[PDB]
Fold carbonic anhydrase XII.
Amino acid sequence: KWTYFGPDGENSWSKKYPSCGGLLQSPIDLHSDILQYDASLTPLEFQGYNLSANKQFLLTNNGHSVKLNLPSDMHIQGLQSRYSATQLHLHWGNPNDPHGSEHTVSGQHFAAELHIVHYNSDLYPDASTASNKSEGLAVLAVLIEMGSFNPSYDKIFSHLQHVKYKGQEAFVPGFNIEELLPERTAEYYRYRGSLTTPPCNPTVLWTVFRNPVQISQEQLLALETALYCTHMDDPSPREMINNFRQVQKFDERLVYTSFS
Amino acid sequence: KWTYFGPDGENSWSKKYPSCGGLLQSPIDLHSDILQYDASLTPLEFQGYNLSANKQFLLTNNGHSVKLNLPSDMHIQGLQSRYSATQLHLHWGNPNDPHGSEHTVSGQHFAAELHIVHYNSDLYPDASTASNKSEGLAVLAVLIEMGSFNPSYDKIFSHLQHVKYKGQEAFVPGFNIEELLPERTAEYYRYRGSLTTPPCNPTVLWTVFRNPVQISQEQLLALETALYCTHMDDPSPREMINNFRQVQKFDERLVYTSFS
Ligand SMILES: [Zn+2]
Ligand SMILES: [Zn+2]
Protein backbone atom coordinates (compact mmCIF):
# COMPACT_ATOMS: atom_id res chain seq x y z
CA LYS A 1 0.00 0.00 0.00
CA TRP A 2 1.06 3.59 -0.67
CA THR A 3 -0.31 7.12 -0.34
CA TYR A 4 0.60 10.78 -0.96
CA PHE A 5 0.53 11.74 2.71
CA GLY A 6 1.48 10.13 5.99
CA PRO A 7 3.66 7.08 6.87
CA ASP A 8 3.30 5.49 3.43
CA GLY A 9 3.83 8.81 1.64
CA GLU A 10 6.21 9.61 -1.21
CA ASN A 11 9.35 9.82 0.93
CA SER A 12 8.70 6.20 1.91
CA TRP A 13 7.79 4.74 -1.49
CA SER A 14 11.38 3.57 -2.06
CA LYS A 15 11.11 1.16 0.88
CA LYS A 16 8.73 -1.13 -1.02
CA TYR A 17 9.29 0.22 -4.53
CA PRO A 18 13.06 0.45 -5.24
CA SER A 19 12.64 2.25 -8.55
CA CYS A 20 11.07 5.20 -6.72
CA GLY A 21 14.53 5.87 -5.33
CA GLY A 22 16.24 5.07 -8.61
CA LEU A 23 17.14 6.77 -11.88
CA LEU A 24 15.12 8.82 -14.39
CA GLN A 25 12.46 9.84 -11.88
CA SER A 26 9.49 12.07 -12.69
CA PRO A 27 7.98 14.64 -12.43
CA ILE A 28 10.46 17.51 -12.80
CA ASP A 29 10.54 21.29 -12.99
CA LEU A 30 10.87 22.72 -16.48
CA HIS A 31 13.09 25.81 -16.37
CA SER A 32 15.41 27.60 -18.81
CA ASP A 33 18.75 26.27 -17.51
CA ILE A 34 17.82 22.70 -18.43
CA LEU A 35 15.70 23.31 -21.54
CA GLN A 36 17.00 23.03 -25.10
CA TYR A 37 15.24 23.51 -28.43
CA ASP A 38 15.42 20.53 -30.78
CA ALA A 39 14.19 21.38 -34.28
CA SER A 40 13.90 17.65 -35.02
CA LEU A 41 10.98 17.21 -32.61
CA THR A 42 8.09 16.86 -35.04
CA PRO A 43 4.33 16.93 -34.30
CA LEU A 44 2.73 13.80 -32.87
CA GLU A 45 -0.36 12.43 -34.59
CA PHE A 46 -3.27 11.26 -32.47
CA GLN A 47 -5.18 8.43 -34.14
CA GLY A 48 -8.42 6.83 -33.01
CA TYR A 49 -8.82 9.50 -30.33
CA ASN A 50 -12.38 10.26 -31.42
CA LEU A 51 -13.97 7.44 -29.41
CA SER A 52 -17.36 6.21 -30.57
CA ALA A 53 -20.24 7.68 -28.59
CA ASN A 54 -21.92 4.28 -29.00
CA LYS A 55 -19.22 2.65 -26.88
CA GLN A 56 -18.86 2.97 -23.11
CA PHE A 57 -15.57 3.46 -21.30
CA LEU A 58 -14.99 2.56 -17.67
CA LEU A 59 -14.30 5.35 -15.18
CA THR A 60 -12.90 4.15 -11.85
CA ASN A 61 -11.88 5.58 -8.48
CA ASN A 62 -8.89 3.36 -7.69
CA GLY A 63 -8.11 5.05 -4.39
CA HIS A 64 -5.32 7.17 -5.88
CA SER A 65 -7.01 9.11 -8.69
CA VAL A 66 -9.97 8.92 -11.05
CA LYS A 67 -9.09 6.81 -14.09
CA LEU A 68 -10.74 6.30 -17.48
CA ASN A 69 -9.91 3.11 -19.36
CA LEU A 70 -8.98 3.72 -22.99
CA PRO A 71 -8.98 1.35 -25.99
CA SER A 72 -5.81 0.09 -27.65
CA ASP A 73 -7.17 1.24 -30.99
CA MET A 74 -6.38 4.86 -30.13
CA HIS A 75 -2.68 5.53 -30.58
CA ILE A 76 0.18 7.97 -30.98
CA GLN A 77 1.95 8.18 -34.32
CA GLY A 78 5.28 9.97 -34.71
CA LEU A 79 7.50 8.13 -32.24
CA GLN A 80 10.02 5.36 -32.99
CA SER A 81 7.34 2.78 -32.19
CA ARG A 82 3.55 2.81 -32.11
CA TYR A 83 2.14 3.47 -28.65
CA SER A 84 -1.46 2.43 -27.96
CA ALA A 85 -3.58 3.96 -25.20
CA THR A 86 -4.48 2.17 -21.98
CA GLN A 87 -5.86 4.81 -19.59
CA LEU A 88 -5.92 8.43 -18.52
CA HIS A 89 -6.13 9.95 -15.05
CA LEU A 90 -5.53 13.21 -13.21
CA HIS A 91 -3.52 14.83 -10.41
CA TRP A 92 -4.70 17.81 -8.35
CA GLY A 93 -4.32 19.78 -5.14
CA ASN A 94 -7.03 20.92 -2.74
CA PRO A 95 -9.47 23.83 -2.24
CA ASN A 96 -7.02 25.75 -0.02
CA ASP A 97 -4.09 25.27 -2.41
CA PRO A 98 -5.41 24.64 -5.98
CA HIS A 99 -1.98 24.03 -7.52
CA GLY A 100 -1.56 20.29 -7.89
CA SER A 101 0.05 19.66 -11.27
CA GLU A 102 2.99 17.25 -11.14
CA HIS A 103 5.29 18.96 -13.61
CA THR A 104 6.05 22.59 -12.89
CA VAL A 105 7.25 25.35 -15.23
CA SER A 106 9.80 27.85 -13.94
CA GLY A 107 8.90 26.68 -10.44
CA GLN A 108 5.18 27.25 -10.93
CA HIS A 109 2.56 24.57 -10.40
CA PHE A 110 -0.54 24.53 -12.56
CA ALA A 111 -3.92 23.76 -11.00
CA ALA A 112 -3.97 20.13 -12.12
CA GLU A 113 -2.50 17.75 -14.67
CA LEU A 114 -3.91 15.12 -17.03
CA HIS A 115 -1.92 12.02 -17.98
CA ILE A 116 -2.87 9.93 -21.00
CA VAL A 117 -0.92 6.68 -20.71
CA HIS A 118 0.08 4.57 -23.73
CA TYR A 119 2.20 1.42 -24.09
CA ASN A 120 4.56 0.18 -26.80
CA SER A 121 2.21 -2.13 -28.71
CA ASP A 122 4.91 -2.92 -31.30
CA LEU A 123 7.13 -4.59 -28.71
CA TYR A 124 4.64 -5.63 -26.04
CA PRO A 125 1.19 -7.34 -25.94
CA ASP A 126 -0.28 -5.08 -23.25
CA ALA A 127 0.40 -2.21 -20.83
CA SER A 128 0.96 -4.52 -17.87
CA THR A 129 3.84 -6.22 -19.69
CA ALA A 130 5.29 -3.02 -21.18
CA SER A 131 5.17 -1.12 -17.87
CA ASN A 132 8.49 -2.42 -16.53
CA LYS A 133 10.35 -2.85 -19.82
CA SER A 134 12.60 -0.78 -22.09
CA GLU A 135 10.68 1.88 -24.04
CA GLY A 136 7.53 0.39 -22.58
CA LEU A 137 5.44 3.53 -22.09
CA ALA A 138 4.70 6.96 -23.57
CA VAL A 139 2.60 9.45 -21.64
CA LEU A 140 1.01 12.70 -22.74
CA ALA A 141 0.77 15.34 -20.03
CA VAL A 142 -1.65 18.27 -20.20
CA LEU A 143 -1.24 21.13 -17.72
CA ILE A 144 -4.56 22.48 -16.43
CA GLU A 145 -5.30 25.99 -15.14
CA MET A 146 -8.44 27.72 -13.90
CA GLY A 147 -10.32 29.69 -16.50
CA SER A 148 -13.26 29.20 -18.84
CA PHE A 149 -15.64 26.25 -18.52
CA ASN A 150 -14.45 23.24 -20.50
CA PRO A 151 -17.28 21.13 -22.03
CA SER A 152 -14.82 18.44 -23.06
CA TYR A 153 -13.33 17.88 -19.62
CA ASP A 154 -16.85 17.91 -18.25
CA LYS A 155 -17.58 14.79 -20.28
CA ILE A 156 -15.47 13.22 -17.55
CA PHE A 157 -16.21 15.52 -14.60
CA SER A 158 -20.00 15.16 -14.89
CA HIS A 159 -19.53 11.57 -13.67
CA LEU A 160 -17.42 12.34 -10.58
CA GLN A 161 -20.32 12.13 -8.14
CA HIS A 162 -20.74 8.49 -9.23
CA VAL A 163 -17.17 7.36 -8.48
CA LYS A 164 -16.83 9.23 -5.18
CA TYR A 165 -15.40 6.28 -3.28
CA LYS A 166 -12.64 3.73 -3.79
CA GLY A 167 -13.59 0.82 -6.01
CA GLN A 168 -16.62 2.55 -7.52
CA GLU A 169 -17.10 2.70 -11.29
CA ALA A 170 -19.16 4.55 -13.88
CA PHE A 171 -19.56 4.42 -17.64
CA VAL A 172 -18.53 7.30 -19.87
CA PRO A 173 -19.81 7.35 -23.47
CA GLY A 174 -17.02 7.76 -25.98
CA PHE A 175 -16.02 11.30 -26.93
CA ASN A 176 -13.10 12.93 -28.73
CA ILE A 177 -10.13 12.64 -26.39
CA GLU A 178 -8.19 15.07 -28.58
CA GLU A 179 -10.58 17.68 -27.15
CA LEU A 180 -8.68 17.36 -23.86
CA LEU A 181 -5.43 18.44 -25.50
CA PRO A 182 -4.32 22.11 -25.55
CA GLU A 183 -3.77 24.43 -28.49
CA ARG A 184 -0.65 23.90 -30.61
CA THR A 185 0.15 20.34 -29.53
CA ALA A 186 3.13 20.60 -31.89
CA GLU A 187 4.79 22.51 -29.04
CA TYR A 188 5.92 20.30 -26.17
CA TYR A 189 8.63 19.30 -23.71
CA ARG A 190 10.26 15.87 -24.16
CA TYR A 191 12.34 13.75 -21.78
CA ARG A 192 12.85 10.21 -20.50
CA GLY A 193 11.28 9.60 -17.13
CA SER A 194 9.16 7.37 -14.95
CA LEU A 195 5.70 6.61 -13.67
CA THR A 196 5.02 9.22 -10.99
CA THR A 197 3.36 6.63 -8.77
CA PRO A 198 4.73 3.36 -7.42
CA PRO A 199 6.34 1.30 -8.78
CA CYS A 200 7.95 4.37 -10.44
CA ASN A 201 9.39 2.40 -13.37
CA PRO A 202 11.82 4.58 -15.42
CA THR A 203 10.16 3.41 -18.64
CA VAL A 204 8.16 6.48 -19.65
CA LEU A 205 8.82 8.70 -22.65
CA TRP A 206 7.24 11.97 -21.51
CA THR A 207 5.59 14.56 -23.71
CA VAL A 208 4.36 17.55 -21.73
CA PHE A 209 2.46 20.01 -23.89
CA ARG A 210 3.63 23.61 -23.70
CA ASN A 211 0.22 25.21 -23.42
CA PRO A 212 -2.28 24.55 -20.64
CA VAL A 213 -6.00 24.03 -21.06
CA GLN A 214 -8.55 25.80 -18.90
CA ILE A 215 -11.39 24.44 -16.75
CA SER A 216 -13.74 26.54 -14.62
CA GLN A 217 -13.42 27.27 -10.91
CA GLU A 218 -16.39 24.96 -10.36
CA GLN A 219 -14.90 22.13 -12.41
CA LEU A 220 -11.64 22.36 -10.47
CA LEU A 221 -13.44 22.49 -7.13
CA ALA A 222 -15.49 19.44 -8.11
CA LEU A 223 -12.32 17.51 -8.94
CA GLU A 224 -10.81 18.59 -5.60
CA THR A 225 -13.85 17.67 -3.50
CA ALA A 226 -15.86 14.87 -5.09
CA LEU A 227 -13.44 12.02 -4.43
CA TYR A 228 -12.33 9.95 -1.46
CA CYS A 229 -9.57 7.33 -1.36
CA THR A 230 -11.61 5.30 1.12
CA HIS A 231 -14.49 2.87 0.54
CA MET A 232 -18.02 4.24 0.89
CA ASP A 233 -18.79 2.22 4.03
CA ASP A 234 -15.66 3.51 5.77
CA PRO A 235 -16.62 5.25 9.07
CA SER A 236 -13.59 7.52 8.63
CA PRO A 237 -13.63 8.91 5.06
CA ARG A 238 -10.40 10.32 3.63
CA GLU A 239 -10.52 13.01 0.94
CA MET A 240 -8.59 12.34 -2.26
CA ILE A 241 -6.58 15.55 -2.45
CA ASN A 242 -2.99 16.59 -3.21
CA ASN A 243 -2.44 13.41 -5.20
CA PHE A 244 0.69 14.63 -6.97
CA ARG A 245 4.35 13.77 -6.48
CA GLN A 246 6.94 16.44 -5.66
CA VAL A 247 9.37 17.30 -8.46
CA GLN A 248 12.54 15.19 -8.56
CA LYS A 249 16.19 16.20 -8.92
CA PHE A 250 17.14 16.62 -12.58
CA ASP A 251 20.90 16.96 -13.02
CA GLU A 252 23.44 16.47 -15.83
CA ARG A 253 20.46 16.27 -18.16
CA LEU A 254 18.32 18.28 -20.57
CA VAL A 255 14.64 18.45 -21.47
CA TYR A 256 14.21 19.12 -25.18
CA THR A 257 11.50 21.36 -26.58
CA SER A 258 9.85 21.48 -29.99
CA PHE A 259 9.64 25.26 -29.61
CA SER A 260 12.33 27.94 -29.25
CA LYS B 1 25.59 6.61 5.36
CA TRP B 2 23.51 8.95 3.21
CA THR B 3 23.94 11.21 0.18
CA TYR B 4 21.97 13.62 -1.99
CA PHE B 5 22.24 11.34 -5.02
CA GLY B 6 22.24 7.61 -5.71
CA PRO B 7 20.60 4.65 -3.89
CA ASP B 8 21.30 6.49 -0.64
CA GLY B 9 19.72 9.64 -2.05
CA GLU B 10 16.92 11.64 -0.45
CA ASN B 11 14.09 9.38 -1.64
CA SER B 12 15.78 6.58 0.27
CA TRP B 13 16.64 8.40 3.51
CA SER B 14 13.49 7.10 5.22
CA LYS B 15 14.87 3.57 4.89
CA LYS B 16 17.43 4.26 7.62
CA TYR B 17 16.10 7.49 9.12
CA PRO B 18 12.34 7.17 9.90
CA SER B 19 11.82 10.87 10.58
CA CYS B 20 12.78 11.68 6.99
CA GLY B 21 9.47 10.11 5.99
CA GLY B 22 7.58 11.64 8.89
CA LEU B 23 5.77 14.91 9.52
CA LEU B 24 6.94 18.54 9.50
CA GLN B 25 9.65 17.98 6.89
CA SER B 26 11.73 20.85 5.51
CA PRO B 27 12.58 22.63 3.24
CA ILE B 28 9.35 24.05 1.83
CA ASP B 29 8.14 26.50 -0.80
CA LEU B 30 7.29 29.81 0.83
CA HIS B 31 4.22 30.84 -1.16
CA SER B 32 1.12 32.92 -0.40
CA ASP B 33 -1.25 29.93 -0.09
CA ILE B 34 0.42 28.89 3.17
CA LEU B 35 1.60 32.28 4.49
CA GLN B 36 0.08 34.44 7.24
CA TYR B 37 1.21 37.83 8.58
CA ASP B 38 1.86 37.92 12.33
CA ALA B 39 2.57 41.09 14.33
CA SER B 40 3.92 39.09 17.28
CA LEU B 41 6.96 38.23 15.19
CA THR B 42 9.27 40.93 16.50
CA PRO B 43 12.92 41.46 15.45
CA LEU B 44 15.51 38.95 16.61
CA GLU B 45 18.71 40.14 18.25
CA PHE B 46 21.96 38.41 17.37
CA GLN B 47 24.25 38.52 20.37
CA GLY B 48 27.83 37.33 20.60
CA TYR B 49 27.99 37.16 16.81
CA ASN B 50 31.07 39.38 16.61
CA LEU B 51 33.59 36.58 17.06
CA SER B 52 37.03 37.61 18.28
CA ALA B 53 39.50 37.93 15.42
CA ASN B 54 42.03 36.68 17.97
CA LYS B 55 40.35 33.26 18.09
CA GLN B 56 40.15 30.42 15.55
CA PHE B 57 37.02 28.54 14.53
CA LEU B 58 36.98 25.11 12.93
CA LEU B 59 35.91 24.83 9.29
CA THR B 60 35.23 21.28 8.10
CA ASN B 61 34.29 19.38 4.95
CA ASN B 62 32.12 16.53 6.27
CA GLY B 63 31.33 15.10 2.85
CA HIS B 64 27.89 16.73 2.77
CA SER B 65 28.73 20.43 3.07
CA VAL B 66 31.33 22.87 4.38
CA LYS B 67 30.65 23.52 8.07
CA LEU B 68 32.00 26.14 10.48
CA ASN B 69 31.80 25.34 14.19
CA LEU B 70 30.37 28.18 16.27
CA PRO B 71 30.69 28.89 20.02
CA SER B 72 27.70 28.56 22.34
CA ASP B 73 28.57 32.11 23.39
CA MET B 74 26.63 33.42 20.42
CA HIS B 75 22.87 33.20 20.60
CA ILE B 76 19.57 34.47 19.31
CA GLN B 77 17.55 36.84 21.49
CA GLY B 78 13.87 37.43 20.86
CA LEU B 79 12.49 33.90 20.92
CA GLN B 80 10.70 32.22 23.84
CA SER B 81 13.90 30.44 24.89
CA ARG B 82 17.52 31.36 24.27
CA TYR B 83 19.03 29.42 21.38
CA SER B 84 22.82 29.11 21.32
CA ALA B 85 24.78 28.59 18.10
CA THR B 86 26.46 25.30 17.26
CA GLN B 87 27.43 25.52 13.56
CA LEU B 88 26.74 26.98 10.15
CA HIS B 89 26.92 25.41 6.70
CA LEU B 90 25.78 25.91 3.10
CA HIS B 91 23.75 24.27 0.34
CA TRP B 92 24.23 24.86 -3.39
CA GLY B 93 23.61 23.61 -6.92
CA ASN B 94 26.02 23.33 -9.84
CA PRO B 95 27.48 25.52 -12.63
CA ASN B 96 25.03 24.32 -15.32
CA ASP B 97 22.02 24.86 -13.04
CA PRO B 98 23.06 27.34 -10.24
CA HIS B 99 19.84 27.21 -8.21
CA GLY B 100 20.60 25.16 -5.12
CA SER B 101 18.90 26.85 -2.19
CA GLU B 102 16.74 24.54 -0.09
CA HIS B 103 13.77 26.81 0.53
CA THR B 104 12.05 28.42 -2.45
CA VAL B 105 9.98 31.60 -2.59
CA SER B 106 6.94 31.52 -4.87
CA GLY B 107 8.43 28.40 -6.43
CA GLN B 108 11.77 30.06 -7.13
CA HIS B 109 15.08 28.59 -6.00
CA PHE B 110 17.94 30.89 -5.10
CA ALA B 111 21.58 30.18 -5.97
CA ALA B 112 22.43 28.92 -2.49
CA GLU B 113 21.41 28.95 1.15
CA LEU B 114 23.18 29.47 4.46
CA HIS B 115 22.02 27.76 7.64
CA ILE B 116 23.09 28.93 11.08
CA VAL B 117 22.04 26.19 13.50
CA HIS B 118 21.25 26.89 17.16
CA TYR B 119 19.98 24.68 20.00
CA ASN B 120 17.71 25.45 22.94
CA SER B 121 20.28 25.99 25.68
CA ASP B 122 17.63 26.89 28.26
CA LEU B 123 16.08 23.42 27.99
CA TYR B 124 19.05 21.32 26.89
CA PRO B 125 22.78 21.08 27.75
CA ASP B 126 24.04 20.73 24.18
CA ALA B 127 23.08 20.49 20.51
CA SER B 128 23.31 16.69 20.39
CA THR B 129 20.86 16.28 23.27
CA ALA B 130 18.54 18.96 21.89
CA SER B 131 18.45 17.69 18.30
CA ASN B 132 15.66 15.12 18.72
CA LYS B 133 13.69 16.84 21.48
CA SER B 134 10.76 19.27 21.71
CA GLU B 135 11.65 22.90 20.91
CA GLY B 136 15.22 21.70 20.52
CA LEU B 137 16.53 23.68 17.54
CA ALA B 138 16.28 27.07 15.85
CA VAL B 139 17.86 27.66 12.46
CA LEU B 140 18.43 30.92 10.62
CA ALA B 141 18.29 30.61 6.84
CA VAL B 142 19.82 33.14 4.47
CA LEU B 143 18.91 32.94 0.79
CA ILE B 144 21.83 33.63 -1.54
CA GLU B 145 21.76 35.00 -5.08
CA MET B 146 24.42 35.92 -7.63
CA GLY B 147 25.33 39.59 -7.63
CA SER B 148 27.94 41.93 -6.18
CA PHE B 149 31.08 40.57 -4.51
CA ASN B 150 30.50 39.91 -0.81
CA PRO B 151 33.56 40.58 1.40
CA SER B 152 31.90 39.06 4.47
CA TYR B 153 31.08 35.72 2.84
CA ASP B 154 34.59 35.64 1.44
CA LYS B 155 35.86 35.50 5.01
CA ILE B 156 34.69 31.90 4.66
CA PHE B 157 35.07 31.24 0.93
CA SER B 158 38.73 32.28 1.02
CA HIS B 159 39.35 29.11 3.05
CA LEU B 160 37.54 26.63 0.77
CA GLN B 161 40.63 25.08 -0.83
CA HIS B 162 41.84 24.22 2.70
CA VAL B 163 38.83 21.93 3.11
CA LYS B 164 38.63 20.74 -0.48
CA TYR B 165 38.23 17.07 0.45
CA LYS B 166 36.05 15.14 2.88
CA GLY B 167 37.49 14.94 6.37
CA GLN B 168 39.73 17.97 5.95
CA GLU B 169 39.70 20.84 8.45
CA ALA B 170 40.90 24.44 8.50
CA PHE B 171 41.02 27.40 10.88
CA VAL B 172 39.01 30.55 10.27
CA PRO B 173 39.75 33.69 12.29
CA GLY B 174 36.70 35.08 14.04
CA PHE B 175 34.66 37.74 12.26
CA ASN B 176 31.21 39.28 12.71
CA ILE B 177 28.80 36.51 11.74
CA GLU B 178 26.03 39.10 11.59
CA GLU B 179 27.74 40.30 8.40
CA LEU B 180 26.36 37.16 6.71
CA LEU B 181 22.76 38.17 7.40
CA PRO B 182 20.70 40.11 4.83
CA GLU B 183 19.17 43.57 5.07
CA ARG B 184 15.93 44.04 7.02
CA THR B 185 16.44 40.95 9.19
CA ALA B 186 13.23 42.06 10.92
CA GLU B 187 11.47 40.67 7.83
CA TYR B 188 11.31 36.88 7.82
CA TYR B 189 9.26 33.73 7.33
CA ARG B 190 8.66 31.62 10.44
CA TYR B 191 7.49 28.01 10.63
CA ARG B 192 7.96 24.76 12.54
CA GLY B 193 9.86 22.18 10.52
CA SER B 194 12.77 19.76 10.51
CA LEU B 195 16.45 19.24 9.86
CA THR B 196 16.89 19.03 6.07
CA THR B 197 19.42 16.20 6.34
CA PRO B 198 19.14 12.86 8.13
CA PRO B 199 17.97 12.19 10.80
CA CYS B 200 15.45 14.86 9.68
CA ASN B 201 14.14 15.43 13.21
CA PRO B 202 10.98 17.63 13.19
CA THR B 203 12.42 19.84 15.93
CA VAL B 204 13.45 22.97 14.07
CA LEU B 205 11.96 26.43 14.49
CA TRP B 206 12.80 27.98 11.12
CA THR B 207 13.51 31.63 10.47
CA VAL B 208 14.08 32.24 6.76
CA PHE B 209 14.98 35.86 6.11
CA ARG B 210 12.79 37.45 3.45
CA ASN B 211 15.63 39.24 1.69
CA PRO B 212 18.58 37.44 0.08
CA VAL B 213 22.25 38.37 0.23
CA GLN B 214 24.43 38.58 -2.87
CA ILE B 215 27.75 36.98 -3.75
CA SER B 216 29.63 37.35 -7.05
CA GLN B 217 29.50 34.86 -9.92
CA GLU B 218 33.12 34.09 -9.03
CA GLN B 219 32.28 33.37 -5.39
CA LEU B 220 29.33 31.16 -6.34
CA LEU B 221 31.43 29.29 -8.89
CA ALA B 222 34.17 28.75 -6.32
CA LEU B 223 31.62 27.29 -3.92
CA GLU B 224 30.16 25.04 -6.64
CA THR B 225 33.51 23.71 -7.89
CA ALA B 226 36.01 23.89 -5.03
CA LEU B 227 34.79 20.98 -2.89
CA TYR B 228 34.54 17.21 -3.21
CA CYS B 229 32.56 14.74 -1.12
CA THR B 230 35.37 12.20 -1.54
CA HIS B 231 38.62 11.90 0.43
CA MET B 232 41.91 13.32 -0.85
CA ASP B 233 43.36 11.31 -3.78
CA ASP B 234 40.32 9.06 -4.16
CA PRO B 235 40.53 7.02 -7.42
CA SER B 236 37.08 8.31 -8.37
CA PRO B 237 36.77 11.92 -7.10
CA ARG B 238 33.20 13.21 -6.78
CA GLU B 239 32.43 16.93 -6.73
CA MET B 240 30.23 18.28 -3.95
CA ILE B 241 27.30 19.80 -5.85
CA ASN B 242 23.49 19.80 -5.63
CA ASN B 243 23.76 19.21 -1.89
CA PHE B 244 20.26 20.41 -1.09
CA ARG B 245 16.99 18.60 -0.38
CA GLN B 246 13.94 18.92 -2.63
CA VAL B 247 11.04 20.95 -1.23
CA GLN B 248 8.52 19.00 0.84
CA LYS B 249 4.76 19.27 0.81
CA PHE B 250 3.50 21.64 3.49
CA ASP B 251 -0.28 21.60 3.68
CA GLU B 252 -1.92 24.03 6.09
CA ARG B 253 -1.20 27.76 6.29
CA LEU B 254 1.32 27.37 9.10
CA VAL B 255 3.99 29.69 7.71
CA TYR B 256 4.00 33.12 9.31
CA THR B 257 5.62 36.33 8.17
CA SER B 258 6.79 39.37 10.12
CA PHE B 259 5.87 41.50 7.11
CA SER B 260 2.85 42.11 4.89
ZN1 LIG C 1 -0.17 10.33 -13.56
ZN1 LIG D 1 21.32 22.97 6.15
About this structure: The interface with chain A takes residues 4-5, 7, 9-15, 20-22, 25, 33-34, 94, 96-99, 104, 106-109, 241-242, 246-249, 251-253 of chain B (CB under 8 Å). DSSP finds four helices and 15 strands in chain B. Residues A 89, 91, 115, 196 surround zinc ion (ligand 1) (CB under 6 Å).
